[PDB]
Paper text:
We and others have found that peptides based upon the high‐affinity Nrf2 ETGE sequence have proved to be the most active in Keap1 binding assays, and hybrid sequences based upon the ETGE/p62 consensus sequences, such as 5, have provided the best short (heptamer) interacting sequences. We soaked human Keap1 Kelch domain crystals with peptides 1 and 5 to determine their bound conformations, with the aim of observing the effect of shortening the N and C termini on the conformation of the peptide. In each case the peptide occupied the binding pocket of one of the two Keap1 proteins in the unit cell and entered into interactions with the vacant Keap1 Kelch domain through polar interactions between the C‐terminal carboxylate group of the peptide and Arg380 of the adjacent protein. Otherwise, the peptide are oriented in a similar manner to the previously described ETGE 16‐mer peptide23a, with the exception of the Asp side chain being positioned differently due to rotation about the Cα−CO bond. Peptide 1 is involved in electrostatic and/or hydrogen‐bond interactions with Arg380, Asn382, Arg483, Gln530, Tyr525, and Ser602, whereas peptide 5 has an additional interaction with Arg415, but lacks the glutamate side chain that interacts with Tyr525. Peptide 5 shows a tighter interaction with Keap1, probably due to the conformational restriction introduced by the Glu>Pro substitution, which restricts the mobility of the peptide backbone. Analysis of the thermodynamic profile of the interaction demonstrated a binding event that is enthalpy‐driven (ΔH), with a small entropic (TΔS) penalty, possibly reflecting the stabilisation of the β‐hairpin conformation of the peptide by the proline residue.
Increasing the activity of the transcription factor Nrf2 is an inducible cellular response to a range of inputs including redox and electrophilic stress and various intracellular stimuli. The main negative regulators of Nrf2 activity are the proteins Keap1 and β‐TrCP, which target Nrf2 for ubiquitination and proteosomal degradation by interacting with degrons in the Neh2 and Neh6 domains of Nrf2, respectively. Inhibition of the direct protein–protein interaction (PPI) between Keap1 and Nrf2 has been proposed as an intervention that can increase Nrf2 transcriptional activity by stalling its ubiquitination and turnover in the cell, thus prolonging its half‐life.4 Recently, several approaches to inhibition of the PPI between the C‐terminal Keap1 Kelch domain and the Neh2 domain of Nrf2 have been described. In this manuscript we describe some of our recent work in characterising the binding behaviour of short (heptameric) Keap1‐interactive peptides by X‐ray crystallography and in exploring the SAR of analogues that incorporate unnatural amino acids.
Numbering used by the authors:
A (entry chain D): 3 to 7
B (entry chain B), C (entry chain A): 325 to 609
Write the structure that this text describes.
């Protein structure tokens, strides 16, 4: 949902 | 002439940007950086001051959920710290009622909150109010008829299509009709007496569909989809139109800003952010 | 002719490199890739085989913390899978005692582990031993006098200057003197009967300070700082010297390799990795 790694 | 402010966000790491878009002449201003970078925060305006609430600083060194409330004064181009919330709240939702800021949901580590707290600028104090019926992170919040709506999100196990409504005078929550689509990380806002939910993630795909809730008929209705699917987008209303900013589409961090005209039921691309990012806070003043 | 191996790491995403530095002639070898890219893993050598333990994978579908143990045979230039750990451990620490691999701490999503488990190559199986006193991720591990030391890290709310010591024969942990500096993601190793803690993140900046522990005096002492600040650095000892590889300085992912000479108490840069990265596993064989 946010693309954070 | 009011500006659209966008604060924080994420691209490779959580960001410190504060930028403002002037929709009448298409320009972007670069304002003073946040003191601590964060994504998954929320923005709102009370009394001409901009507030940045919650979020998480995701850096290559590690992650720190935020309980911070920061205040930006457009006249001085200065950020000032305010009283922190009782808990950190990443992927928070915020709404303003009568000059008070409501912070709803969000996560802290393993904890998915259902608690809700209210900030009073005149006293620089937070107080808990009644908790929601569901734990929600990545929840969209809208204010309509002096009630607070919490829409969608993630309860720690499932992504949600449910929504619920807070009654400030009675201090209590009620479920309302569920959306047609499961949406976590949608943009939620109020336009011409309806609640809109744009984009987000349904558990399989980032979404470009948009649906809107009519409180009197109690039904959700799809409107025109956005041109670009997106989750963890920023959203705001300005001069009768909805602006969506950035987000993640499953592969790209978007710099696209789309603008919804409710009269013609169409989206157009109006500008690009100076760089793609997800998880911004957004507000108009 | 023993080589310094570096496996995996992080530059915009988890990496699959395995490369080997020869300090005698200054060349790098490009060896077979990890089958699964990972950052935050640890490396160690037992019986001439290289082991890659734990870490975190970034993939198009999402992020996955790793419970994997993989074995590289330098004779065949081939990786083979071994038995996996009981739990995923990102930002793991590893030490070897009597040919057994100890995996300490690390994280699985929001879970910050205090558990510790032990691998026996001759049986290809893992067993839990006594847990640490403190949850630690980003922990440095060092083996000295057949004891295992866990140094610094992040317990999930605070970055740590504390350290503790594990007694394999008694199967128990005891706290030892705390470091002068808070450090998570430091390089920790043993040289000339002292435990060194180099770099890391103290909660504010990446660090270039180095301190060493003397077990008999029970005190930490600063030595010469590194030229570059770095966190999530790789570290190992080769022929009486400490080598630190890569890491993050707050702005860039370093390719610098520095070498510490304890006789002269100075750091010098001895080579550059083929590309900058942080979060590598490093071993010597
Ligand atoms: Na997040
Ligand atoms: Na990141
Ligand atoms: Na808490
Ligand atoms: Na929870
Ligand atoms: Na795994
Ligand atoms: Na001791
Ligand atoms: Na670190």
């Amino acid at each position: 949902e946010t693309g954070e790694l | 002439g009011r500006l659209i402010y966008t604060a924080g966000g994420y691209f490779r790491q959580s960001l410190s940007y504060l930028e403002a878009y002037n929709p009448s002449d298409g320009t972007w201003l670069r304002l003073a950086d946040l003191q601590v970078p964060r994504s998954g925060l929320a923005g709102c305006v009370v009394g001409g001051l901009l507030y940045a609430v919650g979020g998480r600083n995701n850096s290559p060194d590690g992650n720190t959920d935020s309980s911070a409330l920061d205040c930006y004064n457009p006249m001085t181009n200065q950020w000032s710290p305010c009283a922190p919330m009782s808990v950190p709240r990443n992927r928070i939702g915020v709404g303003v009622i009568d000059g008070h800021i409501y912070a709803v949901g969000g996560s802290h580590g393993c904890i998915h909150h259902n608690s809700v707290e209210r900030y009073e600028p005149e006293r620089d104090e937070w107080h808990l109010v009644a908790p929601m019926l569901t734990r929600r992170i990545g929840v969209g919040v809208a204010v309509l008829n002096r009630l607070l709506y919490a829409v969608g999100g993630f309860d720690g196990t499932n992504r949600l299509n449910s929504a619920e409504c807070y009654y400030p005078e009675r201090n209590e929550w009620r479920m309302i009709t569920a959306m047609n689509t499961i949406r976590s990380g949608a943009g939620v806002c109020v336009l011409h007496n309806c609640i809109y939910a744009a984009g987000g993630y349904d558990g399989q795909d980032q979404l470009n569909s948009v649906e809107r809730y009519d409180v009197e008929t109690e039904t959700w209705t799809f409107v025109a989809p956005m041109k670009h699917r997106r989750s963890a987008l920023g959203i705001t209303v300005h001069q009768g139109r909805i602006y969506v900013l950035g987000g993640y589409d499953g592969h790209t961090f978007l710099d696209s800003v789309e603008c919804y005209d409710p009269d013609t039921d169409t989206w157009s691309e109006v500008t690009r952010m100076t760089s793609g990012r997800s998880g911004v806070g957004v507000a108009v003043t």
